């Protein structure tokens, strides 16, 4: 029970990211589970608007299909802001772990009040600083500098309590603020980085990986309803392909990315032990103050799973 359809993908970063890949890869099960009648269009590199555009299109339902950072759906439903907290997953499979399971899914649980399907998690990655002022490798350096932050109240209060003026911005716009250096910087993870070609304006990187951003993959619930139970077997089915596929092409993509940037002689600095605990010692204080605009429940509740699978 499979009718002939349209369905159209939109999303910001660009096209030959592992992300873009995987979007593309979702098209394709989507045409072979339901034998070439249900065709995505992809539309990538912020063609059809950035994260808060997408997400106001799903909502309307001039689109159906895009993923978007956890941190512009914080506008919307402030838990989602837990993601924008500094240190919260040790690794990619705590992330995975704690996304997959109750808690992750509470979250995705109060996206459809809001007219939208959280179909599952995808992953953005470890974010890691660049900027083209001079190099950071003491939170000292990051003083003065003017860093872009995603659109989010706790985004824009962790770099403040850091010492950088956080300037919010829609992703689509960062390449030109970083080249115009109307911005110093930008925090993004590597193949990120890579793949919209802020290296060629951002002189220096500092492997900081501060937060992990999941992607949330999201239908819009207005076109959602409307499918046969064919059709939502075909995207949800489609979905759990390309979220495996997503995962393993972002893992390797930042392997890549890291190699790439490096033989490109990129700038590349970390935060030593001693630096590395002094961010934390900063960190705690405002990470506490930001609770009560997050929810307590959900920061508790996330940061208790993470030291489970940990
Ligand atoms: O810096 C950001 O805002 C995010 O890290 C990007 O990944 C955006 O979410 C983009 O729109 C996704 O395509």
Do not use: C
């Given at each position: 029970?499979?009718?002939?359809?349209?369905?159209?993908?939109?999303?910001?970063?660009?096209?030959?990211?592992?992300?873009?890949?995987?979007?593309?890869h979702?098209?394709?099960?989507?045409?072979?589970?339901?034998?070439?009648?249900?065709k995505?269009?992809?539309?990538?590199?912020?063609?059809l608007?950035?994260?808060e555009?997408?997400?106001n299109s799903?909502?309307?339902?001039?689109?159906?299909?895009?993923?978007?950072?956890?941190?512009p759906?914080?506008?919307?439903?402030?838990?989602?802001?837990?993601f924008?907290?500094?240190?919260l997953?040790?690794?990619?499979?705590?992330?995975?772990?704690?996304?997959?399971?109750?808690?992750?899914?509470?979250?995705?649980?109060?996206?459809?009040?809001?007219?939208?399907?959280?179909?599952?998690?995808?992953?953005?990655?470890?974010?890691?600083?660049?900027?083209?002022?001079?190099?950071?490798?003491?939170?000292?350096?990051?003083?003065?500098?003017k860093?872009?932050?995603?659109?989010?109240?706790?985004?824009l209060?962790?770099?403040?309590?850091?010492?950088?003026?956080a300037?919010?911005?829609?992703?689509?716009?960062?390449?030109?603020?970083?080249?115009?250096?109307?911005?110093?910087?930008?925090?993004?993870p590597?193949?990120?980085?890579?793949?919209?070609?802020?290296?060629?304006?951002?002189?220096?990187?500092?492997?900081?990986?501060?937060?992990?951003?999941?992607?949330?993959?999201?239908?819009?619930?207005?076109?959602?309803?409307?499918?046969?139970?064919?059709?939502?077997?075909?995207?949800?089915?489609?979905?759990?392909?390309?979220?495996?596929?997503?995962?393993?092409?972002?893992?390797?993509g930042?392997e890549?990315?890291?190699?790439?940037?490096?033989?490109?002689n990129?700038?590349?600095?970390?935060?030593?032990?001693?630096?590395?605990?002094?961010?934390?010692?900063?960190?705690?204080?405002?990470?506490?103050?930001?609770k009560?605009?997050?929810?307590?429940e959900?920061?508790?509740?996330?940061?208790?799973?993470?030291?489970?699978?940990?």
């Amino acid at each position: 029970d499979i009718k002939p359809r349209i369905i159209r993908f939109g999303y910001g970063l660009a096209d030959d990211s592992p992300t873009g890949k995987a979007s593309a890869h979702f098209a394709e099960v989507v045409s072979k589970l339901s034998d070439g009648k249900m065709k995505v269009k992809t539309f990538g590199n912020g063609a059809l608007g950035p994260d808060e555009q997408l997400i106001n299109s799903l909502i309307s339902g001039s689109g159906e299909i895009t993923f978007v950072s956890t941190a512009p759906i914080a506008s919307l439903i402030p838990e989602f802001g837990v993601f924008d907290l500094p240190f919260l997953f040790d690794n990619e499979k705590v992330a995975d772990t704690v996304l997959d399971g109750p808690e992750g899914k509470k979250l995705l649980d109060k996206l459809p009040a809001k007219g939208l399907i959280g179909l599952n998690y995808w992953e953005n990655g470890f974010r890691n600083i660049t900027n083209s002022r001079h190099e950071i490798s003491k939170l000292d350096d990051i003083g003065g500098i003017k860093l872009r932050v995603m659109q989010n109240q706790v985004a824009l209060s962790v770099f403040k309590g850091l010492g950088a003026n956080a300037i919010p911005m829609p992703f689509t716009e960062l390449f030109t603020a970083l080249e115009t250096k109307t911005v110093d910087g930008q925090e993004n993870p590597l193949s990120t980085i890579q793949t919209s070609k802020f290296y060629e304006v951002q002189p220096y990187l500092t492997l900081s990986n501060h937060v992990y951003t999941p992607f949330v993959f999201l239908a819009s619930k207005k076109w959602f309803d409307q499918l046969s139970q064919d059709e939502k077997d075909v995207i949800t089915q489609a979905a759990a392909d390309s979220q495996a596929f997503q995962r393993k092409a972002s893992r390797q993509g930042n392997e890549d990315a890291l190699k790439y940037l490096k033989e490109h002689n990129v700038k590349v600095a970390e935060f030593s032990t001693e630096e590395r605990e002094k961010i934390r010692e900063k960190v705690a204080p405002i990470v506490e103050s930001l609770k009560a605009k997050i929810g307590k429940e959900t920061v508790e509740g996330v940061l208790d799973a993470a030291k489970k699978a940990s």
